[PDB]
Nucleic acid binder design. Structure first.
Lengths: 98, 344, 122, 501, 107, 529, 23
DNA sequence: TAATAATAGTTTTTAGTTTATTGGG
DNA sequence: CTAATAAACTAAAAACTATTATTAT
């Protein structure tokens, strides 16, 4: 239940459907409860590797990024999955132009 | 995926070469996409499109933690592709550029992530050792020898074996066509001799290798390869300092005698680097040769014209080396430098 | 006829062209039979690959223009088939038509000379 | 080899082709349109790789780069497409000819030299490996330019020019109430009956032809070794290949563009993307499963280099002919790498035909493939009435089963029957004998696949009916035999036992 | 778009060649802001039908959709209105549309 | 179903003696039993195995009573073999130091077969015996063994190191044992086993006896436990008023292993962590993901691809009508040629089982076809799902019965045509007469059949139809090598595999001289590969 | 050339599939 | 100082799965 | 009380061009 401190969001775009549902069930089992990205309380946003800030904005119809939501890739969460404890999002954060 | 992939790949290569220290803001993510599409099982792309292998090598960036973490996955993928392909006796010895791909890859990656603490070391070392014809092209041999020249420091500590085989294979590589192959072979020679010099400096049982290789080669000299052995003979004096310290200034005496013999071509810089190395080893100098030393070096300075830029830079590096070597003995330093600059 | 190395049939073409141009030093023509003989030995076994056709016509008409008389239409057919110096060779073979200007303007309308001469090469 | 082919079609614009002596009969224009559509669809089915064009002349308008008057090209030399089929289809019929006369000119004077020139020009405008020449024409008039004898002279001059430049033409008879009367202007300018009628080879064009006819291609370049060092150039072919439906072309729902396929493997517990190196071949035999990698799996599959090594000689009668495993192959001698191998092939075929013995030979088709044992069956060259080969010369390739390939059969005994019944169905078979011919049995199921395919492609009003030949005409045989079948039923079966359960 | 009614209700614009051509219909649909497809879909509520041929036979046997004549679409275009559904521009129809017509009188 | 089969082997030293120049019967028996065990284990059939071993240094038998039933040790009863049995076979099977009589071991084997058959259905019982017959024995219970066989009807197959009746080949073509190497005890045991097997079966039973070397060359070792595959119960169709119920069987088929290699993680070593998937996205519109139900097939019609669905095709395609199978026409057997025999597999068709009237009718048909040299073209459909096929069937009478064999035939679309040169006119490749005679001599020295004396039959130096696939054997060898020792590289193609794979060297040596003759008489040159 | 496919050079002409004709 | 020899890139079989399709017990 | 299996399906490798670096001086 080490992931119970995570209220993140998963994006179907860029993530395989089997991969997406696997990540969903993994985060739910470890206590992590998903929330809508455009809503508040988003710890992280599960996107693909090659996501762009403006591309994500127009994909989710967000004029601005949600507060506290980090545009992180699936590699970090998969990593935390095999070694069973959290890792920093460094090396997984996509740059946000001003 | 065709010729467009080829010249796009060279777009990326030259862009990495030229644009540095600034355009690195948006390069890690595209690297990750290329790594992802490499992992695609759909191996339709041609046997030339995989040069994205060596295009994985990034050196214009500080290389932050992202591909640092990716590096181990990178390395296992590379060794898997290697052990799949380069096995000449597994019925698929088809590597037109594949080995060169892995070469440029490892050259641009292993600059900063290697350690003398694993069996992976001897694994990739012997995989280099496996490197029979290329129809006077020899892209794979020149590639492997350039890699060895650039990373012999990271290939150290396990080359104690098969040194003799390395000797003759590099000697034979030093005599073919494709002048780039010879110069890569040369650079491999200096890298390897530097590594073995460090090894015998830290060795205790170096005498076996000494008697097996070095005096044999030096006496067997009795064109360019001869001068390569002149370099090696001049510089291997580490064990001579370690054991038979008299032999140090002994072989010094014979080599300066041969300097007089050749005194009265393209042989002078070899003698220059040799005397630089031995004076770095040497502590007490027979002063009778110091006027001979300054006379011969200023005559060498007079020979600076009728040289191509290659031996021009070689001899300038040699004169810097000898000037550094003579700096150990302060009075000798000042007197000799004053005499040589005045005469020159 | 043998096509393995360019020099063999190239030298053959140049010598045959010079013989045709200087048979008894132009004072007569009585070896015409050999002229259609060489034209035949060319067109048979050369009008099916045409790789050395252009170069051999070049090297024979460098001395003897009037031998193309059996081959204007043949060379016109092969005009839009190359991209490199082959195009230049066929163009200069056409240039050797210094005698037969019955009608060439419409042929070159049909073959689109203009984009060919857009191409940069001296 | 011979590369792409080009077929070009010419029809004059004149009122003669829009009219017929009998209005029940088609117009030459309309029959030409329907025939050209038929040959277009036949070629699309058969050998769509080649190049076709449509061009008209004699109109009130012209379409060509040369800007020769009334010379109107319609479709340039291109691989045929359904859009071409339909855009030539709407002009069929009475309304089709009416709308053609409306939007397109029809009926004017011209020259044959200029149309020949422009057709040769557009033929030259193709940058593909040409194989053959076919420039069709359609006219009911044999003297279209006899008014100007100079026009006839330049026309025959340009025909000589095309035949010099390796161009071949062909002429189609069109119906003429006065007789088409060939040799008036042809048989000399081109390369018999006056032909009041028209059907000379159009009937071969109208019949539907559906095939693929794979071109001349070697199956494998193979090197034969007798013992250890006898090198022979041999070429393997097949006279038969299983015909299959073309693969479906996966594509998008709405835009219908062909979607590319992405295939990848990723972790379950980790969730991350897997790697090809991590993939390991696994099989579970007994308790302990087997861990393996693919490369050494084909290395185990790798036994010997490709080649054919003679394993001896056996008379053709000793082998039991029912032993087959695959469609038989056919080898031909080669002289590509080895010179003189054909002499050896001739000598061995002559000697083996004299001695009627097969040649057992171990077979290895491709590298890292299991070897196999094949016997070489010689084949002679048989000609037809016109001395054209019907049985190719060379060697057939028969395949012999292993011990395991022979499935065990349940026990069966020998049961005898009355010779009276034997003679009875001897008479029965003699009643219904015929001679087999290989050119009369197709797969109508694939034909129906194609039929529906053009039905949907061209929006044909009906799904074209497959003319199946596999169904017997049971009524005919029952009429021929009749009271013999129940005679068999009484002779053999008990007169209370239905054949059903 | 300008119609503000062509939004939603996926239209299967593939059979409009009665007398008018194909492209003009979907160009005017897109000007009016309408959905475009040439095959049945879950969102495809209606399918236009011009000429009648084997695809109509398929949609009859595979009763996934109905037959809509282009007259209704032309009326919607000229009037800038959503003309309702009445049995004059129907040929084939879904069973659910059959009980929809059961509301009218029977069919 | 399950077959109660047990293998009995002596653990004496007579066969374990190191025979100079020839593999000892101990080693030959070990090779054959290893082959059988690996075949059975990797087939994973439901037939169990027990371990009965006589001549062992120990004595553990269910009927031990002193002197008799001695030196017999039983380790494992009739259970499914595992890799433990394989490692015991390669390890525990060693030269022994005790001798006894095999009759007691056979008695305890049949005793445990009878005892352990309760509680489990067995299709049949089997046992095979590997003895060198070079040990003194008492012919006491052999008749009692025969009597017990009469009241039990157990399948028996006999294999001995000596041949029943040269170059050193294992399973190939040569003498399995010289006729002089057998001792008097070997001949006595040969006579005893001959009369025993005659009493059990007879001449066919004598044919069931084979040699240690050549047992690997044939499937007759597996002949006792073979089971035929499924069949096709249908009805022959002649017009409308004539029909015969039939049960067609697949005679010859290129069999394929059921088991294929799966994919496991390098660390998890299981399929569970592995998750292969396929992705479809709009490549044109910037990799926009495409739903697996928003995806359509198509076909390249003309110079374009026409859009086309799937369900529409199957509802407009051709529809077959069940498992129809009807004769079509009547043609002479001379019209058809061997090269046109299509179809991957070979089908043997037979009537409904025990339908005597149908059998008599088809037999009369067979006789008429044979006398008329007659064949009939038949259209075949496996079921409504299958695409219907056509072909011809012919009758084949053996010495014991008559068989019907059906073969599929091609279409015009299947036919391929090409232009080939006339080699007769090829004056550039016309051989000389002396070269032709040399070729004839090479064929004679290389021919594999000589007209048998005193019999009109033709000898066959190469019975290759009874050689199974060696590829499977190499697969299974490397499989067991990896299973036992997943460390070292795989074994290569061992020489004895070639020995039952290659021709005998006698014909090769005969052809050596003519090989030189033609390679000298025929000049030739070759180009670089 | 007679006996060759007029629609396909290098290939023979093929007569339409007929089926059977009993005697 | 500037040539020609290896040499990939499309069809096209074909094995290698896979399946969804029966009756077996 | 649980199957080969025909067809479908993708994969993989050869064949035929196929210009394109590539040494000599």
């Amino acid at each position: 239940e080490w992931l119970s401190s995570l209220r993140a969001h998963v994006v179907r775009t860029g993530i395989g459907r089997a991969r997406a549902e696997l990540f969903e069930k993994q985060i739910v089992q470890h206590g992590g409860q998903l929330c809508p990205a455009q809503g508040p309380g988003v710890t992280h946003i599960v996107v693909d590797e090659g996501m762009d800030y403006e591309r994500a904005l127009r994909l989710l119809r967000l004029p601005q990024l949600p507060p506290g939501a980090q545009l992180v890739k699936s590699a970090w969460l998969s990593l935390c999955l095999q070694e069973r404890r959290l890792v920093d999002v460094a090396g997984f954060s996509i740059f946000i132009p001003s | 995926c065709k010729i467009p992939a080829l010249d796009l790949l060279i777009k990326l290569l030259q862009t990495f070469r030229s644009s540095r220290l600034m355009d690195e803001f948006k390069i890690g993510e595209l690297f990750s996409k290329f790594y992802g599409e490499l992992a695609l099982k759909k191996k339709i792309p041609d046997t030339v499109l995989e040069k994205v292998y060596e295009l994985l090598g990034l050196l214009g960036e500080v290389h932050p933690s992202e591909m640092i973490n990716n590096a181990e996955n990178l390395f296992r993928a590379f060794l898997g592709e290697l052990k799949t392909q380069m096995t000449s006796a597994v019925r698929e010895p088809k590597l037109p550029v594949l080995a060169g791909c892995l070469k440029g890859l490892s050259s641009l990656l292993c600059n900063f992530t290697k350690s003398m603490e694993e069996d992976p070391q001897t694994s990739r070392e012997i995989f280099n050792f496996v490197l029979q014809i290329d129809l006077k092209r020899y892209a794979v041999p020149s590639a492997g020898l350039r890699l060895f020249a650039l990373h012999a420091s990271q290939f150290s500590t396990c080359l104690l074996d098969n040194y003799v085989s390395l000797f003759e294979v590099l000697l034979k590589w030093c005599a073919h066509t494709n002048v780039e192959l010879k110069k890569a072979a040369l650079s491999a020679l200096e890298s390897f001799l530097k590594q073995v010099s460090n090894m015998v400096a830290k060795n205790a049982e170096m005498h076996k290798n000494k008697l097996q290789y070095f005096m044999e080669q030096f006496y067997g000299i009795i064109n360019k390869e001869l001068s390569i052995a002149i370099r090696g003979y001049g510089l291997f004096a580490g064990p001579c300092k370690v054991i038979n310290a008299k032999d140090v200034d002994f072989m010094y005496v014979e080599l300066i005698q041969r300097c007089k013999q050749m005194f009265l071509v393209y042989q002078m810089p070899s003698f220059l680097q040799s005397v630089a190395s031995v004076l770095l080893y040497l502590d007490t100098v027979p002063e009778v040769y110091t006027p001979v030393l300054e006379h011969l070096v200023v005559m060498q300075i007079d020979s600076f014209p009728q040289y191509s830029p290659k031996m021009q830079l070689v001899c300038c590096r040699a004169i810097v080396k000898v000037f550094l070597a003579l700096a150990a003995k302060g009075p000798v330093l000042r007197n000799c430098i004053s005499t040589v600059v005045h005469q020159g | 006829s043998f096509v393995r190395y360019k020099e063999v049939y190239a030298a053959a073409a140049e010598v045959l062209g010079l013989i045709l141009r200087y048979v008894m030093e132009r004072k007569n023509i009585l070896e015409e039979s050999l002229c259609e003989l060489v034209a035949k030995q060319l067109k048979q076994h050369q009008n099916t690959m045409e790789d050395k056709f252009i170069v051999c016509l070049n090297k024979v008409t460098k001395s003897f223009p009037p031998l193309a008389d059996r081959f204007m239409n043949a060379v016109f057919f092969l005009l839009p088939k190359f991209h490199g110096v082959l195009k230049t060779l066929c163009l200069e073979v056409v240039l050797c038509r210094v005698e037969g200007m019955t009608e060439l303007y419409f042929q070159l309308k049909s073959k689109d000379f203009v984009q060919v001469m857009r191409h940069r090469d001296d | 080899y011979s590369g792409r082919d080009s077929l070009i079609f010419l029809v004059d614009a004149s009122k003669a082709m829009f009219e017929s002596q009998s209005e029940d009969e088609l117009t030459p224009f309309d029959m030409s349109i329907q025939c050209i559509q038929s040959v277009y669809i036949s070629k699309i089915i058969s050998s769509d790789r080649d190049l076709l064009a449509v061009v008209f002349y004699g109109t009130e308008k012209d379409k060509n780069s040369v800007n020769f008057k009334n010379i109107y090209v319609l479709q340039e030399l291109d691989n045929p497409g359904a859009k071409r089929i339909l855009e030539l289809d709407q002009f069929k019929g009475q309304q089709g000819q009416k709308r053609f006369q409306d939007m397109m000119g029809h009926g004017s004077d011209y020259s044959l030299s200029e149309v020949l020139w422009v057709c040769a020009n557009l033929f030259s405008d193709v940058q593909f490996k040409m194989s053959h020449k076919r420039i069709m024409l359609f006219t009911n008039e044999d003297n279209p330019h006899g008014n100007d004898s100079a026009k006839a002279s330049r026309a025959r001059t340009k025909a000589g020019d095309l035949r010099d430049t390796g161009i071949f033409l062909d002429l189609m008879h069109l119906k003429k109430p006065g007789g088409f009367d060939i040799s008036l202007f042809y048989r000399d300018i081109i390369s018999l009956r006056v032909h009041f009628e028209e059907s000379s080879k159009l009937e071969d064009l109208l019949r539907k032809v559906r095939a693929k006819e794979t071109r001349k291609r070697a199956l494998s370049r193979l090197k034969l070794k007798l013992n250890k060092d006898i090198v022979i150039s041999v070429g393997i072919y097949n006279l038969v290949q299983k015909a299959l439906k073309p693969p479906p072309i996966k594509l998008y729902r709405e835009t219908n563009e062909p979607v590319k396929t992405k295939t990848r493997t990723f972790n379950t517990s980790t969730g991350g993307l897997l790697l090809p190196s991590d993939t390991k071949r696994s099989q579970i035999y007994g308790s302990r499963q087997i861990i393996l990698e693919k490369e050494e799996t084909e290395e185990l599959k790798r036994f010997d280099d490709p080649g054919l090594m003679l394993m001896g000689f056996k008379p053709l009668v000793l082998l039991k002919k029912h032993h087959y495993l695959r469609p038989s192959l056919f080898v031909y001698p080669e002289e590509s790498l080895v010179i003189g191998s054909s002499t050896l092939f001739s000598a061995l075929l002559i000697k083996c035909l004299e001695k009627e013995v097969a040649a057992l030979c171990r077979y290895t088709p491709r590298r890292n493939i299991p070897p196999y044992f094949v016997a070489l069956v010689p084949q002679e060259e048989e000609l037809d009435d016109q001395k054209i080969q019907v049985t190719p010369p060379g060697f057939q390739l028969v395949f012999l089963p292993f011990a395991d390939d022979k499935r065990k059969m349940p026990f069966t005994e020998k049961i005898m029957a009355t010779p009276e019944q034997v003679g009875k169905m001897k008479a029965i078979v003699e009643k219904l004998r015929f001679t087999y011919r290989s050119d009369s049995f197709e797969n109508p199921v694939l034909q129906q696949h194609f039929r529906n395919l053009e039905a949907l492609a061209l929006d044909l009003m009906e799904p074209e009916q497959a003319v199946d030949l596999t169904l017997p005409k049971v009524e005919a045989m029952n009429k021929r035999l009749g009271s013999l079948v129940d005679e068999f039923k009484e002779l053999v079966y008990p007169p209370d036992y239905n054949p059903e359960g | 778009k300008i119609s503000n009614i062509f939004e939603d209700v996926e239209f299967c614009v593939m059979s409009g060649t009665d007398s008018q051509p194909k492209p003009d219909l979907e160009n005017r649909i897109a000007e009016f802001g309408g959905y475009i497809v040439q095959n049945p879909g879950p969102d495809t509520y209606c399918v236009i039908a011009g000429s009648e041929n084997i695809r109509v036979k398929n949609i009859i046997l595979s009763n996934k959709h109905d037959v809509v004549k282009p007259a209704w679409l032309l009326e919607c275009f000229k009037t800038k209105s959503f003309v309702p559904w009445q049995p004059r521009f129907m040929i084939h129809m879904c069973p659910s549309t059959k009980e929809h017509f059961a509301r009218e009188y029977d069919c | 179903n399950k077959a109660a089969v047990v293998l009995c082997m002596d653990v004496g030293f007579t066969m374990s003696n190191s025979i100079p120049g020839i593999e000892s019967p101990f080693e030959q028996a070990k090779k054959v039993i290893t082959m059988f065990v690996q075949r059975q284990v990797f087939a994973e059939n439901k037939d169990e195995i027990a371990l009965v071993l006589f001549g062992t240094d120990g004595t553990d038998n269910p009927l031990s009573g002193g002197d008799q039933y001695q030196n017999i040790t039983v380790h494992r009863h009739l259970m499914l073999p595992d890799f433990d049995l394989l490692e015991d076979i390669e390890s525990k099977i060693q030269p022994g130091s005790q001798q006894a009589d095999f009759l007691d071991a056979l008695i305890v084997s049949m005793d445990v077969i009878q005892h352990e058959t309760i509680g489990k259905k067995f299709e049949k019982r089997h046992i095979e015996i590997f003895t060198d017959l070079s040990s003194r024995f008492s012919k006491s219970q052999l008749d009692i063994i025969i009597h017990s066989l009469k009241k039990c009807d157990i399948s028996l197959q006999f294999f001995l190191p000596f041949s029943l009746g040269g170059p050193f080949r294992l399973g190939g073509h040569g003498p399995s044992f010289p006729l002089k190497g057998i001792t008097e005890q070997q001949k006595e045991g040969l006579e005893i086993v001959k009369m025993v097997m005659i009493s059990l079966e007879g001449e066919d039973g004598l044919d069931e006896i084979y040699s240690f070397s050549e047992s690997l060359r044939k499937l007759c070792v597996f002949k006792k436990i073979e089971r035929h595959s499924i069949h096709w119960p249908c009805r022959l169709t002649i017009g409308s008023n004539l029909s015969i119920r039939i049960a067609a069987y697949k005679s010859i088929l290129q069999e394929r292993v059921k088991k294929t290699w799966t994919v496991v993680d390098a660390k998890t070593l299981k399929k569970e962590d592995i998750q292969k998937e396929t992705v479809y996205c709009l490549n044109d519109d910037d990799e926009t993901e495409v739903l697996k139900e928003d995806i359509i097939q198509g076909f390249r019609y003309g110079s374009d691809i026409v859009p086309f669905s799937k369900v529409d095709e199957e509802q407009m395609k051709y529809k077959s009508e069940g498992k129809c199978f009807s004769v079509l026409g009547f043609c002479k057997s001379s019209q058809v040629q061997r090269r046109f025999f299509m179809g991957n597999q070979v089908l043997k068709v037979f009537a409904a089982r025990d339908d005597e009237a149908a059998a008599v009718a088809l037999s009369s048909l067979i006789h008429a076809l044979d006398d008329l040299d007659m064949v009939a073209i038949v259209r075949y459909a496996y079921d409504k799902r299958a695409n219907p096929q056509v072909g011809v069937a012919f009758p084949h009478i053996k010495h014991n019965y008559e068989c019907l064999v059906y073969v599929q035939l091609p279409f015009m679309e299947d036919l391929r045509q090409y232009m080939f040169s006339s080699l007769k006119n090829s004056k550039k490749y016309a051989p000389t007469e002396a070269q032709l005679n040399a070729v004839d001599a090479l064929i004679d020295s290389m021919s594999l059949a000589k007209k048998d004396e005193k019999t009109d039959t033709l000898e066959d130096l190469f019975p290759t139809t009874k050689i199974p696939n060696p590829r499977f054997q190499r697969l299974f060898q490397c499989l067991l090598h990896r299973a036992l020792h997943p460390r070292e590289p795989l074994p290569p193609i061992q020489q004895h595999i070639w020995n039952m794979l290659n021709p005998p060297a006698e014909v090769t040596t005969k052809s050596q001289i003519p090989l030189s003759k033609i390679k000298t008489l025929f000049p030739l040159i070759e180009a670089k590969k | 050339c007679p006996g060759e496919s007029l629609i396909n050079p290098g290939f023979k002409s093929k007569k339409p599939a007929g089926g059977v004709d009993f005697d």
